[PDB]
Design a binder for this molecule. Sequence first.
Ligand code: LJU
Ligand code: LJU
Ligand code: LJU
Lengths: 244, 244, 244
Amino acid sequence: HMMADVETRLAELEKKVQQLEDVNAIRRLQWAYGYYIDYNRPEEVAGLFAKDGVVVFLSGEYVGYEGVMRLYGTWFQNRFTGGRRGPVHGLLLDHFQLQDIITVAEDGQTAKGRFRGILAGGWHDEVLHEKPDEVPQQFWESGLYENDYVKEDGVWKIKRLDYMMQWQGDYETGWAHTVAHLQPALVCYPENPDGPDRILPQKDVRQTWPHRYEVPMSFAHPVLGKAFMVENFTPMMMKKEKPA
Amino acid sequence: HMMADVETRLAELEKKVQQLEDVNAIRRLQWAYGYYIDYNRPEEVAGLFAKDGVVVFLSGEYVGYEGVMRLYGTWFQNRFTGGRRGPVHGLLLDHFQLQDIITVAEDGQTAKGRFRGILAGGWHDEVLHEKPDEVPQQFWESGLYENDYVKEDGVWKIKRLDYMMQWQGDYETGWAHTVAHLQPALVCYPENPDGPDRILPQKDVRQTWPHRYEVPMSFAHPVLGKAFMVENFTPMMMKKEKPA
Amino acid sequence: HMMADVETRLAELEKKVQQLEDVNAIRRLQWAYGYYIDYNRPEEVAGLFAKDGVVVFLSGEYVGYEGVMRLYGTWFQNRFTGGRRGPVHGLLLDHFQLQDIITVAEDGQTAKGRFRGILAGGWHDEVLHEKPDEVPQQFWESGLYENDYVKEDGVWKIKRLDYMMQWQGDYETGWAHTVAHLQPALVCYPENPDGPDRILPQKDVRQTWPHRYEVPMSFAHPVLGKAFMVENFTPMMMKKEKPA
Ligand SMILES: COc1cc([C@@H](O)[C@@H](CO)c2ccc(O)c(OC)c2)ccc1O
Ligand SMILES: COc1cc([C@@H](O)[C@@H](CO)c2ccc(O)c(OC)c2)ccc1O
Ligand SMILES: COc1cc([C@@H](O)[C@@H](CO)c2ccc(O)c(OC)c2)ccc1O
């Protein structure tokens, strides 16, 4: 009667409040991830992952704690700090994280999120001698994430972090005059000590800047949903003979 | 009795949970908008608008789907990609979106939001020949939004997107040595194929960088509210004879 | 019976909804703060603080309204606009704010938040003659915040704003070739008209870029919590003889 109504209203509020909390907790993961990677702290990063978690970098999959520690630790921390937990003198690696769009599964057990970063990177002249030869002294970089999350034992965890670098620009010359200094993975671990456990299938492998490939949205069109159709709107614009 | 109390508490929670969901849904619109414009996808952008929606760009109003497709499509997509859905080889148009302050109307049917973007734009040397003559090869740009939202048939939609560009900086020279390459609208559609349906009244027309004009906050002072008065605090500072 | 269950469920929802609202209100403070400082509006900034609030800048504490007005007003507004409420012609001071991680106390009366800013700053050539001698014409800057919040009379307020600048880069040369043009505080107010009420204890004083110091996280590890231990993961990486 009145009590069936109260039960339905409570249950509905509990579900909605759960989803609002889930969104905050998933965003917190990605923002926390950012603050750890800025400090070259691979251990904190590995801890954010499910034990069967994966990170994807330059079309290569790194599997579990060991894989995450090999990417952020063996490769990145040696490259940027010589194997020190940061921050350290004269080394900038600020990955400004923003623009989260999170989609929680209806059952509350998994989620997707799109996010992005803009990286200001580099070695100050006082520590330039620590920089490896292949890398610009200072550069901008941007990338897109399309991540998967899993809820295990009440806790949101990274199930798949897929970082798809979009562009780099040497500070001095900019994105217009820079070719990426990173290329898609070619050699797996353990032949390549910095290498992935596996390379994505070729159809999924991405060439780097100035090459561009769409990263599909994990979110539906937020107004028209699955009913959105491109061809319903294209006829309203004019394609011109050349750019103006 | 006890049941009047339960009813009041449920109703109060339903209202607060509705407002929390409304804030997430309005932010999602603006973040989604960003990801679409970065890809030169005008169709997805037009779909975010109410059918009587308006976009304001350089002091010009573009009305409805047709107007939004003329701005993002006829003008922007031709300018940046030659009329291709992006992303495309060597063309960067990353509008990093952040700093949302959303104010939902008490009745839950409309809202305002302030947001901002920083744009990293440009043509890689490999596609520089596609760039129109008026536009720098690579540039930074920032702008402020003060938008209106409407809830129709249960869905948050853009009612007014008002993008007020604040500065541009050629990559090579920076904001200090750059004058905006865009000026306030002068000619409406259809005389100007890229033009607005109408130009704002003169009092509201904005000159561009290095000219600056306040964009009033859509939010009340979040601590003192309408009781905030500038003159209560100014006397505590010292104005100096010159900048130090 | 059924009514004890309904009471427990309501109370639990009221607590969770309160915390979700608290997070939005604390983020709103920091985003609002950003929009005010971009406009050189020290009065709005002072109003966000508790009356016993503190702002920390270059290892100096500025106490209460008077202190906040001396920093943002006496020092910053004179430096950037000659003592005018902004925005003004040719003066850019955009502090892009992002990456909030807020932790509300269990009792709902206090909170911590980590945030960050990237500042695009400078004088256009048309107003370069207004720039003080010590300051670059145009520069990037980034900083970290670890702030404290208090809830007083139902309203979230800034209890401690601790801005820890991390790097500056002259636009023309970048962070790699720039030394900070600001140094830790040396002289208190009123001997130094721009000075803090007190200088932090020496152990807490920070040298500026290219010097780097950790800013500890105010948040627990969001997956493993206090159980997180660095030494559980370090053995999985290889430290190399030199950076690669
Ligand atoms: C996988 O997670 C991320 C990875 C990146 C990298 O593309 C950055 C890492 O700083 C990188 C840039 C230049 C380099 O030479 C480099 O060497 C190995 C790595 C960025 C953000 C991420 O979330
Ligand atoms: C209306 O919505 C937006 C518009 C802008 C434009 O100011 C950008 C669009 O990329 C622009 C910059 C340089 C150009 O030459 C140009 O040519 C027409 C357009 C930015 C963000 C928005 O949300
Ligand atoms: C305390 O709050 C903030 C302070 C800063 C400053 O480091 C900026 C302020 O614009 C600054 C940069 C160059 C200067 O020469 C300068 O002169 C005094 C100040 C930045 C963000 C904040 O939240």
